[PDB]
Design a protein around this nucleic acid. Structure first.
Lengths: 451, 446
RNA sequence: AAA
RNA sequence: AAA
């Protein structure tokens, strides 16, 4: 009966935060990193999230210490209702019901005073934002909801700085999910400009705008914001993360490594940094290949070794880091370690990424591996088709269609009356939009089928 | 040397008239019918054609009689004489009387030179262009495109010429009849028919054609006005009865149409067009009864008249088809098969007709012979003639029905899957067409 | 956080 | 000249 009341409270226990079991350690580390290095006006939500994590670990006593710390720092506000809601849920799981009802009454009293329509569900913009920040911290499966929280606020107060920031970040990350789909549009460009305007001293938002400007070819304008963000000390380690990405994609790879190595001293468990660092060594590996033996060779194997070390570290800390697992498997091919590349690809082939489009790249690169390392056109076709089976138009999907086409044409030159090759070729022409030639080949193949 | 000059004369011997052997008896009759009952200003052409027909029969002496009869009524000077003189030249050449052939050659040369004609023997004038058009228009449908060209050639210099306006309108009307069942068929012969009536106000033959064409285009009321005008006047009676009867039959007044056909048959009993029209009347009354002694009686009468038409003109394709379809009504599946196989060996001048042959034979195989396989064979053969039409759309539907029936008994039949995909392709559903092709190609994995 |  |  008390449970029916607790379920109405707005807090981490009722926000249906999707948290995979394999992501708990990395989540905890990312929460702790944020407590130390992220500069924000309010730090109530982050400590409340830490408490919820502790609870999920079975350390309920430790959660109360993070809730009580969240309340002490609050002294230095309606957002307290989030803390009181977690208090109520905690005491409930611990059998201390009497104390739980006290915090239910605290929430009810405030709800009573603010003429709130609900007995326990406080309807205000601050708590909408707290829900948004929690979702935006617990993995990509929650970003659509997170954007909705912030968007809900901007429908009544379009210049609310906090929601404008959460909305911009969510939109930017969702754009990142679709960065390789055809006709993808920068929905997050204007929201980011608006967020920077309403948070002029926020560097975290400035670097995201820079990267989005770089995405749209306006690289020069983006670097202006990079320099502005690096100026203020606000959340500098996070500015180092995204500043490195900008400089790497700009071509100044050496500048990025320096920033990442600095950032790694502060957040040594950041899988994002480990991945970025690996991408840097991968970038330097392509630079030398342009011009290997001697000290030139010792450099590649050293960098390949480092890229593997950091990619291997990222997936160790976060086993759900799919694209890092993919970069790892691809790097083992650069090292000639087909044994380990096969091992990781088999891991990737059993995954179901949140961004399902990523599965195209998994099948595509494994297809190339089959085509070039294993010289097995049969298995290359299987995985080029599986990549194509995810209809969402993209760059990798076009590459899968072309690789399928070229490789199928090779079969027909050795055997022009191969039924399977004719039908696959007709299938290719269907994907290319030329329906007349597709019907032609399907019909030609269906004649050979009549035997 | 003499032959080279004869090949330059404009007459039936150099007009490349396509006359199938089996069409000679009917042509000879239709020519005699025309001489007797068609009222035209100049009857020189039809007698010259009659002469040419007799020459082809091996009766050269009888041909000269028709050329000399053609020269008389003309006098009752005309440039059309060159057609007769040209035929005379050709006749005497075949009969070894070369010296006489040269006499007529000189007569043609003498006229060509006096009229400042560019050629020595080929007279360029609209009168002979019309004569060529009339000859082509009388020797079957394979010549109609050339016929229209002759009259069109004259209308390019004299758009108000009444004679060429009539020939062009009749050729266009018949040519529109060839494409009457094709999709998006346009009535290109309507306005030429109105103009032909304007320039030939006392010509009922053209009036009834304008009526029938109005009936085709939903203007049946306006058409019946011209039908009554043609019947009032008694010019070309028996011919006005033919097309008036068709007009009333397609309206629903069958008894009125039978009255006119039985009158016209007394005058031109050998006309295959009448016997066919009579059969269509009995077929119409048959359908009326359906919606016993009379039914079996008329079926016997319709078969008798269709049988009479094909007997007199073996190349009368659609009459042969109405015959085969009528034997089915009579429960004589043996004669139907016999006549359908005759049709299956034909090659109609109007190739589109072969869709109806295969389509109706497909139905015969589906419903009477209880063989869907042959029905599919012939529905496909009707479809293979890509010209869009009513029958082709019905062949696609009939094929679709059968393939769907087969799939109910066996959903994993490769052939049925591939055919249904072929069907959806003809219907314009490329997406559903590719779907069933891919489904079939999977079963073809082994 | 690859692309 | 069926349609």
């Amino acid at each position: 009966q008390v449970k029916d009341s607790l379920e109405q409270l707005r807090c981490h226990f009722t926000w249906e935060l999707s948290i995979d079991d394999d992501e708990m350690p990395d989540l905890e580390n990312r929460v702790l990193d944020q407590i130390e290095f992220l500069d924000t006006k309010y730090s109530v939500g982050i400590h409340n999230l830490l408490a919820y994590v502790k609870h999920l670990k079975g350390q309920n006593e430790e959660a109360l210490k993070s809730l009580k710390e969240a309340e002490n720092l609050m002294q230095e506000n309606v957002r307290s209702l989030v803390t009181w809601g977690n208090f109520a849920w905690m005491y409930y799981h611990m059998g201390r019901l009497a104390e739980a009802q006290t915090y239910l009454d605290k929430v009810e009293n405030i709800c009573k005073k603010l003429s709130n329509p609900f007995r326990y569900r406080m309807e205000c913009p601050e708590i909408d934002c707290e829900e948004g920040w929690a979702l935006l911290k617990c993995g990509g499966k929650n970003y659509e909801r997170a954007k909705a929280c912030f968007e809900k606020v901007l429908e009544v107060d379009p210049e609310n700085p906090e929601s404008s920031a959460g909305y911009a970040i969510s939109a930017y990350r969702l754009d990142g999910f679709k960065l390789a789909t055809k006709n993808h549009k920068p929905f997050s460009l204007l929201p980011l400009r608006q967020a920077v305007r309403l948070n002029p001293d926020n560097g975290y938002i400035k670097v995201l705008l820079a990267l989005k400007l770089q995405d749209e070819g306006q690289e020069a304008e983006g670097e202006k914001y990079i320099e502005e963000a690096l100026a203020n000390m606000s959340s500098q380690t996070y500015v180092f993360r995204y500043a490195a990405k900008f400089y790497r994609r700009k071509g100044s790879v050496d500048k990025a490594l320096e920033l990442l190595k600095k950032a790694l001293q502060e957040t040594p468990t950041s899988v994002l940094l480990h991945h970025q660092i690996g991408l840097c060594y991968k970038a330097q590996m392509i630079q030398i290949k342009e011009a290997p033996r001697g000290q030139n060779r010792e450099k590649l194997d050293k960098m390949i070794r480092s890229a593997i070390f950091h990619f291997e570290s990222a997936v160790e800390k976060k086993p759900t880091f799919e694209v890092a697992h993919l970069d790892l498997a691809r790097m083992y091919i650069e090292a000639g370690n087909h044994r380990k590349a096969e091992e990781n690809f088999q891991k990737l082939l059993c995954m179901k990424p949140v961004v399902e489009e990523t599965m195209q790249d998994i099948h595509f690169h494994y297809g190339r591996f089959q085509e070039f390392q294993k010289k097995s056109d049969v298995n290359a076709i299987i995985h080029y088709l599986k990549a194509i089976k995810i209809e969402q138009a993209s760059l990798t999907r076009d590459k899968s269609i072309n690789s399928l086409k070229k490789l199928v044409l090779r079969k027909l030159r050795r055997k022009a009356l191969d039924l399977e090759s004719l039908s696959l070729l007709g299938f290719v022409y269907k994907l290319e939009g030329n329906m007349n030639e597709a019907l032609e080949y399907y019909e030609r193949a269906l004649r050979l089928a009549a035997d």
